[PDB]
């Protein structure tokens, strides 16, 4: 269906310890595929998926240079933002930046984005059009006028509409046995109680990809908000992801409710009743 | 990564 590419950048200053901690990471959909960690030995952008390794050394050389240049610019930022925020040199601060591009099922551009946080909150962000800027507050407005004079927004649009989409397309057709292959969930049913009849049960999705899994509990006869409670989808650590939803039922014996599971990798949404 | 538009604040 739809796909995306996102790059996530995290820079954490260290009062003292000269060089801040820069960790950069690349995703197509829910699959990491490149990283950089300023702390590691290689000092290069490294692959984290089979299919990006195809790319030749020229690719890696330039991903490396750009990622390092990002790192040095967040380095400057940290100091500049201290100044704007009257902060001391002691105390560690966090600069974060994410950007990317979504495509629909025809693989054309839908939406592009570019955001920047400071100490965990919104500092400045490209609006939906790819030309105006939401700036949190005073300091952020000085960054805003600066980037407006420099036409940052049109540089980002060129990147986000074109390049980002062109490569996401390339990566989807290059990685096609990973990114386009669709693993339905495996399927459980768990009955919990205690030694006086008090029981709840939760249907399990396991080993599914991609990660969005809407999973419901059919009230035999209902109104259209209904009371389950679910853990957040969690990584299996290999390819896949896993998740469960729990609805509470009569303190003893009831087959009245049932699991509506719809996952893109699944022709028939998957009904399951309780049994051993 | 991006090549254009990336500036200090």
């Amino acid at each position: 269906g739809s796909h995306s590419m996102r790059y996530f950048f995290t820079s954490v200053s260290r009062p003292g310890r000269g060089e801040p901690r820069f960790i950069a990471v690349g995703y197509v959909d829910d699959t990491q595929f490149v990283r950089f960690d300023s702390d590691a030995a290689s000092q290069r952008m490294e692959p984290r998926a089979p299919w990006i390794e195809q790319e030749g050394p020229e690719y890696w050389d330039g991903e490396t240079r750009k990622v390092k240049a990002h790192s040095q610019t967040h380095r400057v930022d940290l100091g500049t933002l201290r100044g704007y925020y009257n902060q001391s040199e002691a105390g560690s601060h966090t600069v974060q930046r994410m950007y990317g591009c979504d495509v629909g099922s025809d693989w054309r551009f839908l939406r592009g984005y570019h955001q920047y946080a400071y100490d965990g909150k919104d500092y400045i962000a490209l609006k939906e059009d790819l030309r105006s800027w939401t700036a949190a507050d005073m300091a952020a407005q000085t960054t805003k006028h600066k980037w407006e004079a420099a036409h940052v927004a049109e540089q980002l649009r060129a990147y986000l509409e074109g390049t980002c989409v062109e490569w996401l397309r390339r990566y989807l057709e290059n990685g096609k046995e990973t990114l386009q292959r669709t693993d339905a969930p495996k399927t459980h049913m768990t009955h919990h109680a205690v030694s006086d009849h008090e029981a709840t049960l939760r249907c399990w999705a396991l080993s599914f990809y991609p990660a969005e899994i809407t999973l419901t509990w059919q009230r035999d006869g209902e109104d259209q908000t209904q009371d389950t409670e679910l853990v957040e989808t969690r990584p299996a650590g290999d390819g896949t992801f896993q998740k469960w939803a729990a609805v509470v039922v009569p303190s003893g014996q009831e087959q009245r409710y049932t699991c509506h599971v719809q996952h893109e990798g699944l022709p028939k949404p998957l009904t399951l009743r309780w049994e051993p | 990564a991006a090549g254009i538009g990336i500036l200090t604040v």
Partner: T-cell receptor, first 109, second 115 residues
Framework: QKEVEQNSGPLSVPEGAIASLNCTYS??????FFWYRQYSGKSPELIMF????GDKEDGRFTAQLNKASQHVSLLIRDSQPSDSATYLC?????????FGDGTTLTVKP | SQTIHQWPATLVQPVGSPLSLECTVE??????LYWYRQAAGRGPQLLFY??????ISSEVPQNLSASRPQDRQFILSSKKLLLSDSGFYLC?????????????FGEGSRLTVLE
């Protein structure tokens, strides 16, 4: 130069005519492009840059880009003899510029 | 009014002499700074690409190093110059980061190395 190809020249255009200079880059992932002028004995001087498909006009100069064919051009309207110079194409392949060896132009007065 | 001057302009030296070239930028802060070398008939080739906090890239030239004593001062040197080191040495800056500001070369330093 596999990475960035220009015809060498020398290429003559006559005073008043449009000189039209071409460039072909091979790095798929370039995101911005630059034209430089270089007079005999001097360091290159930046005529212009572009980061998007289509034409960019700065007075007598017009830069053009076609990502699909990885092609870049400069056009110089109403060529003067003092435009005789070597015109150097450059491609940003990530934090830096990579250059062709230039086409040398001669505007015969 | 950004600017970038390099020194010295022209040099004639024997094989094995040490080399020192200096470059200074003005009117911008924390610039990316570049050393390129240009041979007759050819385009500038990259030697060194430095961020404001240190080296990002080098095309690993034998017999040549770079350093950056100030933010705006940059330096190329060699311990014993080879003949092959003859060329047109050019310094450039770009505005901090990955963008379109800058990209100007100074006036270059021409080096001839004689046997």
């Amino acid at each position: 130069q596999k990475e960035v190809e220009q015809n060498s020249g020398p290429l003559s255009v006559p005073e008043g005519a449009i000189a039209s200079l071409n460039c072909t880059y091979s790095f798929l992932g370039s995101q911005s492009f630059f034209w430089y002028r270089q007079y005999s004995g001097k360091s290159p001087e930046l005529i212009m840059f572009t980061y998007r498909e289509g034409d960019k006009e700065d007075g007598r100069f017009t830069a053009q880009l076609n990502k699909a064919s990885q092609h870049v051009s400069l056009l110089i309207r109403d060529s003067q003899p003092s435009d005789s110079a070597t015109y150097l194409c450059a491609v940003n392949d990530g934090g830096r510029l990579t250059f062709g060896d230039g086409t040398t132009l001669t505007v015969k007065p | 009014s950004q600017t970038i001057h390099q020194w010295p302009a022209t040099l004639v030296q024997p094989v094995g002499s040490p080399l020192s070239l200096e470059c200074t930028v003005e009117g911008t802060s924390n610039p990316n700074l570049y050393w390129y070398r240009q041979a007759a008939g050819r385009g500038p080739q990259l030697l060194f690409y430095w961020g404001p906090f240190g080296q990002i890239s080098s095309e690993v030239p034998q017999n040549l190093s770079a350093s950056r004593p100030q933010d705006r001062q940059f330096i190329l040197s060699s311990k014993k110059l080879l003949l092959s080191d003859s060329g047109f040495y050019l310094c450039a800056w770009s505005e901090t980061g990955l963008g379109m500001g800058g990209w100007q070369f100074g006036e270059g330093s021409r080096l001839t190395v004689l046997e």
